[PDB]
């Protein structure tokens, strides 16, 4: 029996909020990246450090620790880029037209154009960001969504499955709880719930497109990829 299912809605929220990874910085340098090398250099370095925080974050997601080590590995291998991207989109919410990879690294689509096949992904991220903004997405909602991605994205590529789906149900309850607390009507609740979960389909799309692009520069040998990033990437092929 998992502790996750015995948690109340507010306990679930507080657990996720406190498990939140910090916002990392990129290297301090006013040199705005335009070359493919320098931009991807800054992005890989950042992604690599964020991955270590993500791993220790995932272990603090209720129900994740009850999974076998292998299942934990599979879910992270499947979801990591989605988790990075929705984080990026969340951080960039209050910066319209901008992507806040780090507080000292604000990228616009003009810089995305300066790598081949990147601007389309930039535009999708920017659209998701403005979408988050027009919905007035809250932090409590954000952490629920990120947890959903972690548990859902690799669940159909597998009784620990029923466990994941019970935990998934628990998060749904938590999302509804947050909307009820925010004063939303019953109709507004299931409409907003649906709106949030449909964006996950787009997040999945961006991750898949990104994964293709990362495989290219990996085969290109453009930019130095760490062994950890290489292993996460190989899991998708």
């Amino acid at each position: 029996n998992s502790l996750a299912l015995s948690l109340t809605a507010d306990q679930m929220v507080s657990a996720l909020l406190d498990a939140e990874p910090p916002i990392l910085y990129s290297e301090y340098d006013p040199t705005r990246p335009f070359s493919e090398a320098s931009m991807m250099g800054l992005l890989t370095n950042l992604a690599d450090r964020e991955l270590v925080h993500m791993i220790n974050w995932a272990k603090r997601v209720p129900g994740f620790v009850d999974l076998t080590l292998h299942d934990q590995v599979h879910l992270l291998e499947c979801a990591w880029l989605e988790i990075l991207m929705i984080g990026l989109v969340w951080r960039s919410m209050e910066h319209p037209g901008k992507l806040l990879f780090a507080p000292n690294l604000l990228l616009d689509r003009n810089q995305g154009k300066c790598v081949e096949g990147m601007v389309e992904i930039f535009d999708m991220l920017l659209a998701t960001s403005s979408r988050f903004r027009m919905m007035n997405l809250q932090g409590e909602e954000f952490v629920c969504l990120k947890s959903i991605i972690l548990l859902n994205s690799g669940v159909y590529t597998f009784e620990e499955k029923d466990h994941i789906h019970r935990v998934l149900d628990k998060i749904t309850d938590t999302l509804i709880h947050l909307m009820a607390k925010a004063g939303l009507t019953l109709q507004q609740q299931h409409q907003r719930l649906a709106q949030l979960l449909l964006i996950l389909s787009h997040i999945r799309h961006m991750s898949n497109k990104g994964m293709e692009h990362l495989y290219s520069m990996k085969c290109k040998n453009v930019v130095p990829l760490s062994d950890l990033l290489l292993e996460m990437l190989d899991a998708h092929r």
Binding site: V52, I55, K59, L69, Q72, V73, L76, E77, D227, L228, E231, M232
Partner: peptide, 10 residues
Amino acid sequence: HKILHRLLQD
């Protein structure tokens, strides 16, 4: 033997 295997333990 994956790095992720090790990182999920520490």
